[PDB]
């Protein structure tokens, strides 16, 4: 019944201090055990940072120490990381997580870029059926996520209610420094008319939330 | 610092065959003789890692018995006895014995399974991202195996190159195959100057290309 949750800011510019938090539900920071930050190099491998113990006390990895502290507000049973000075080297995904011997809970983990540019919203266009998709028994479509900064874009189909068929690919970067992605999902080339598919994108640096309707 | 080395780096696995994976840390990791401090960790793409093995050898609640880890000193190994598809993943190794605890740099699990031909579809660029002044077509491959496609972009039978770029996805939980698709970018400008817009896919599953094209 334990959940750890981090929550932060998914951008920060080079040299500011990098400022995260963990709230714990269904267990309290105090009674026992070592809470945690750990970090993933985007497609690498995973770093520890330091714990906080029930008691208060901290350790940190020797890699990371002069420029870390961790801290705890035990009143809102939460516990925080904050890295200072940062660079590029520091953008990866953000782990929280309780040891209690070893790493029984963790978080979802926030990714953290690091970098000096602005936030920018996506584009959302529609991919549409064309008519040799509609000919067989089953047809393609989707939704093309473009020009958006700072990593990660959310899809979902029909508010969560489309799951199976549903391919949403990895952000591939542009030659304009921006992301890129696109969401598709296979359907019954009968359904088309009968059944409405909206694809809901979430940009959330940006405050960006669409619900684009796809019809051919 | 105490390395983890884990070996292989990635590793092929037929479909409900065994594997092992093997993690080998540079000094002893032995507590006081009277316990080991050493995890074993799975991570599906984008999820948080889940525990699955503590203490070398005692499996955590909840994951399946068909994994088990043994091993001690500074030889350990995690088994899978029947692999299933959703086994597919990352693996990694955790020493929280000598600080600054450290992890190993993963192995990939790559599941084998029979050549599957992909289903292939052809996107023409939204009217709406057209007045914006850029075209993007959408070339999608969907479910197939292996990795391994060429897709190849003709414009009025001419062979593109420079201007296009592809993203895949992981392999699927369930049927183990993969997704692709290619993106060809081009300016509103250089795109009305064409017509055939043909996407020729080379794969194992096709006894020759196939190609989805259209006009305009």
């Known amino acids: 019944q334990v959940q750890l949750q981090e929550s932060g800011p998914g951008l920060v510019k080079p040299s500011q201090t990098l400022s995260l938090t963990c709230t714990v539900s269904?267990?309290?920071?105090?009674?026992?055990?070592?809470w945690n930050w750990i970090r993933q190099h985007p497609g690498k491998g995973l770093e520890w940072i330091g714990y906080?113990?029930?008691?208060?006390?901290?350790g940190y990895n020797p890699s990371l120490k002069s420029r870390v502290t961790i801290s705890r507000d035990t009143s809102k049973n939460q516990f925080s990381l904050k890295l200072s000075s940062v660079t590029a080297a520091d953008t990866a995904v953000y782990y929280c997580?309780?040891?209690?011997?070893?790493?029984?809970?963790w978080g979802q983990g926030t990714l953290v870029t690091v970098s000096s540019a602005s936030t920018k919203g996506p584009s959302v266009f529609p991919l549409a059926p064309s008519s040799k998709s509609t000919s067989g028994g089953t047809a393609a479509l989707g939704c093309l996520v473009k020009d958006y900064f700072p990593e990660p874009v959310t899809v979902s189909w029909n508010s969560g209610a489309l799951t199976s068929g549903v391919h949403t690919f990895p952000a591939v970067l542009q030659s304009s420094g921006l992301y890129s992605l696109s969401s598709v999902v296979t359907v019954p080339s009968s359904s088309l008319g009968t059944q409405t598919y909206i694809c809901n994108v979430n940009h959330k640096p940006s405050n960006t939330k669409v619900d684009k309707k796809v019809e051919p | 610092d105490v390395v983890m080395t884990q070996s292989p780096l990635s590793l092929p696995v037929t479909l409900g065959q065994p594997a092992s994976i093997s993690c080998r840390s540079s000094?002893?990791?032995?507590?006081?003789?009277?316990?080991?401090?050493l995890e074993w960790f799975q991570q599906r793409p984008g999820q948080s890692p889940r525990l699955l093995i503590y203490?070398?050898?005692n499996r955590f609640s909840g994951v399946p018995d068909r994994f088990s880890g043994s091993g001690s000193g500074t030889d350990f190994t995690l088994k899978i006895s029947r692999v299933e598809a959703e086994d597919v993943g990352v693996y990694y190794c955790?020493?929280?014995?000598?600080?600054?605890?450290?992890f190993g740099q993963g192995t990939k699990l790559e599941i084998k399974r029979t050549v599957a031909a992909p289903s292939v579809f052809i996107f023409p660029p939204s009217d709406e991202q057209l007045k914006s002044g850029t075209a993007s077509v959408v070339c999608l491959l969907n479910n197939f195996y292996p990795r391994e496609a060429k897709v190849q972009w003709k414009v009025d039978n001419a062979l593109q190159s420079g201007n296009s770029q592809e993203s895949v996805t992981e392999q699927d939980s369930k049927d183990s195959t993969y997704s692709l698709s290619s993106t060809l970018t081009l300016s509103k400008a250089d795109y009305e100057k064409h017509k055939v817009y043909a996407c020729e896919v080379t794969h194992q599953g096709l006894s020759s290309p196939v190609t989805k094209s259209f006009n305009r």
């Open positions: 906080i113990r029930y008691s208060g006390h901290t």
């Open positions: 955790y020493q929280g014995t000598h600080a600054p605890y450290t």
């Open positions: 997580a309780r040891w209690v011997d070893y790493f029984d809970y």
């Open positions: 203490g070398v050898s």
């Open positions: 000094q002893s990791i032995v507590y006081n003789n009277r316990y080991t401090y």
């Open positions: 269904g267990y309290s920071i105090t009674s026992d055990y070592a």
